Assembly symmetry: D2
Homo-oligomer: 348 residues x 4
């Protein structure tokens, strides 16, 4: 024969049902999986000491927000948080379950330079991944996340063939391992905005990358019905003085997905990748005005859901109520954007 053995129907059903629950209409993912060093940066921007207690306070602030599950279908956690208790002693997973938010877990081990490239990155973490997935499922996670990173640099030929091949291979292996352990894999091939390239260059690169990713998923026997994609939107580079219009970003982003993503995939959950809170909502809203689409177009936002929540918290306990109000405003905006109903706050 030589083909993939059949996936367990019972496992496949669970994966597909959970992927559709995560990609639920009017809802998206809160990406709260900042590692210890990344959350330091976020905290440094508001001058807060990165104690375990402060991290526990902040994650509890997020996850105990009443009514958050109206707009948030899932929450990506860092490992620490998956096994953490709020300051009041409630396990973080229990706060999520009380809102009906599905817990998810970041499972990559970060980035390492590929030898003899110009600082292009492999994502590490396959070793022990299968055993980690089993433990995380027992702890309550039902989906996973693995971040790969590519750069655009026309003068240096980035992303190089080796970069794309490595990104696709790691994502495909990770996704198949997740599905073997009953976790829905979020496949995150992030093309960074670094540089002064045009939106049309971002579109070309995104198409090449996604074509390679999805071919590799097929090669590794990944069940698209039980997976999710977390791509960059298609935008101008971050060094461009003029940001592309929301209409342009929506057009090129949808076009790049429809040219590469098979429609058995239930959901595309965009990363916000440095965009402002309002841009992230407006760009998603614009895409869902041009629906209906073959897959759900929604959000998996970190900064774009938390930026103002952090600035409102300021590390000050007393600002907890106000901070959660801010988070709800952004969760509502992006849930409405998923439906193409947010009111603000063809090229071949």
């Amino acid at each position: 024969s030589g083909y993939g053995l059949p996936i367990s129907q019972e496992v496949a059903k669970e994966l597909a049902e959970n992927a559709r629950k995560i990609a639920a209409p009017g809802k998206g993912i809160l990406a709260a999986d900042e590692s210890t060093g990344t959350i330091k940066k976020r905290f440094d921007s508001i001058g807060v000491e990165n104690t375990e207690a402060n991290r526990a306070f902040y994650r509890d602030l997020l996850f105990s927000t009443k009514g958050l599950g109206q707009y948030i279908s899932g929450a990506i956690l860092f490992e620490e948080t998956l096994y953490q208790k709020s300051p009041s002693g409630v396990p973080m997973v229990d706060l999520l379950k009380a809102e009906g938010i599905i817990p998810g877990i970041k499972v990559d081990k970060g980035l390492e330079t590929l030898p003899l490239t110009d600082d292009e990155k492999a994502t590490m973490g396959l070793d022990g991944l299968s055993e980690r997935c089993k433990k995380y499922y027992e702890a309550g996670a039902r989906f996973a996340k693995w971040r790969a990173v590519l750069s655009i640099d026309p003068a240096k030929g980035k992303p190089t063939n080796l970069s794309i091949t490595e990104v696709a291979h790691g994502l495909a292996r990770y996704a198949a391992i997740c599905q073997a352990n009953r976790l829905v894999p979020i496949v995150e091939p992030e093309i960074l905005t670094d540089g002064s390239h045009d939106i049309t260059v971002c579109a070309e690169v995104t198409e090449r990358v996604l074509a390679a990713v999805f071919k590799a998923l097929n090669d590794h026997h990944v069940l698209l019905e039980g997976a999710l994609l977390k791509p960059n939107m298609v935008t101008h580079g971050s060094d461009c003085p003029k940001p592309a219009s929301h209409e342009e970003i929506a057009f090129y982003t949808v076009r790049s997905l429809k040219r590469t993503v098979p429609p058995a995939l239930p959901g595309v959950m965009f990363l916000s990748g440095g965009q402002s809170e309002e841009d992230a909502s407006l760009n998603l809203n614009e895409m869902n005005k041009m629906g209906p689409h073959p897959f759900q177009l929604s959000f998996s936002y970190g900064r774009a859901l938390q930026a103002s929540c952090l600035k409102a918290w300021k590390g000050v306990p007393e600002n907890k109520a106000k901070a959660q109000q801010v988070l709800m405003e952004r969760a509502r905006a992006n849930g409405e954007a998923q439906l193409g109903k947010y009111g603000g706050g063809y090229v071949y």
Copy 2:
């Protein structure tokens, strides 16, 4: 840079508009492009001499059928027919245009064994293809067709890697050449039904083949918005005593497409590949009961539109009216099947 140069917006617009016209709701393609030797077989089944006059009579019988354009959006021609006149002196293309049927042209040069394979086939015809496309466009063709063939044989490991790679390469080159010459390419990777394999084996092979085909189309800069796919339905092998149910064929066929075909492609126009006239209609109808779909699911039928028309004609002139009536009955059935409205005549 290293990426594909931008396709002409004017050419791309024409290709996309013509592809959508071919994949029009409630309509499909009449495949009337039997070569001289293939039409001999079809004629041998009803005992008719394969004279040029008989071929001209029969193609005129088909294309002059009044009202055919209600259900037929396009007609694939053999080169002879593109430049032929009916017995009454009317160019065949003019009969088509009078019904508003778009003319199309078969442009491959047939099959040749790949060296050191077990009679696995390459499709020939790239040499001079670009110049042929230009002439065919001037003669009135607006779409093309290229047939590749794969076999399932688990004991022999068919289709082999070399078979799939060759099929994908030839289809991608052909499609890019067509689009450079303003012809919509129909991409036909036919997996033959030969053998006693199960429908699930057909499904696995179809997925592997289509994944490879679409990756190659992307590699060769083929515009999916201006292309069409003509695949096999997913069925049991032809040596199986029990034909799969229409519900099963519909489920596995749609599943295989949704797992591999990006939704920028406007249409999937199935070949009937030996099925009976009624099975071809019922299977398509069943797929369009389970819509709406991300692309149009329709037909590009030869035998399944002509079988009874031939048997009613019998080479006898006087049976021309009755023969056209039969053709209209089948065109109507398949147009209705495209809409999921023909009344007869999840596994992961």
Copy 3:
């Protein structure tokens, strides 16, 4: 540009010089890198308790054999042994250096099933590999080893495409990481002898696998001048009642290498993979009667250098002298075989 950055000339020179020293005429590698569980098996065959002291005694028995460096250019160690002292307190690396034997280190983390394959194996260990390599170099290792495993099973289509792709990817990543850290990578794609296939089937599979491996090495910017290959010899399957002649094994093995291995690689150091001590020597000798070759054909033997040494030791201290004599007899036989001078003890 988009190509690999230039490797450091200083690092490349060191790698190339050490690879040529390992592939030195009349010499080969002693593979003494059995993990804790593998050495248990070897010890179980002679009824010896797998204490750390016994492992230290045995490795000291091997490495303190006087005159061993006449025939052994390098010794592959398990991590424990790299940082271990003999029972008398001499570091194992110091015993090696006193004989001028280069220390090497096994750096893979073993095998894991690829999801939805029929128990086909990925090799794990890239995570932390670069940091491990740095530490191992400081501890005295100058080469590394990474074992991948493939199976032949015609009825199951093994090795599958996914198996070969994964094996090649892991070996290429590992090799580039090693070279970035000044370790010569031994690239070991072992096709197991399991099954009843003919030597011609082994030859076909070996060629396909090595073609894929070397293409991946090129893709990952691996310096062939500073690498070594450790392949299976080409033989009948282990279930065959008739073992292939030494002349046949030599012919098909050399043919498979010359059809796939670029001659910039300095050495091919065969694994013995279950062969008897005498067969391993006779097969290598036969290959080097048909020289001179474009690369050194030599040995990296574990069982084929140690089998009789173990049976002579029997865990009994007093048998240490006799055991080392046995080891020297086999080291001499294989060094002589490297030169085509061991006296015993074209098809396209």
Copy 4:
């Protein structure tokens, strides 16, 4: 199974024997296969009318040179010449056979732009190739030639992935078809010298291209024992004011081959690609001073064997003797260069 069927031992033996005869020590190929339009250019440089009679006169001048077979093992012909008679009525093939020179035939149909590339070229000619090969064998050809062309342009990312993939595919198909018809295929992937890139850029590109070519040859079941490679030497771009030294060209050329070409290939027969007659000889001589090599390094020269012969002929009949003397001087120089005996006339 899924692997290539076994090549006929009888056919394989013939191919291997003829490939070794072509790659014979102290000998190389005269490339006299200029098409009608290419020979016009060569003739335009000396002001001669491109009549069939003039072409027949010139090819007869070349092939009737007494003693030419001491240094020329084979002669590549254009189709016209294969079926042509000298002005005196002797078939061209008979002149070759009288000197024991093997006739060869160019079988590609030239170059066509790949759609949506920046004028990157596919080589056409697979259609009817197998039937042409049969006729050419009956006419006396025992080897074939197929030219593919790649460009270096770092700013444009040339050669692009599509260029390399297409070149490799066409060469592999052509080579397998030739071998099925008892013709030794010369595999010619010519990287043009156009541009101002350094020799190290040429080296990197040549390695990438040859790695891809040889992987494709393996994929298509091409017998390396019965094939030949005709690559560019590795040199500075033609816009560079300083030509690389003969020592540099020799070093980088040999290095690029040893890093990519399996040593089962019997011969590498360099194209001269615009070099002067004397540079072509000196560069080859320098490579064969650094032997012995795993394959024969020799020549398949057109301009570098004929330039002075043409200028001495000047279209004037009376200069026939002098012209043949010039040709013999260059044939002798390059035969001596093959042996590293022409007297004039490590970086990782």
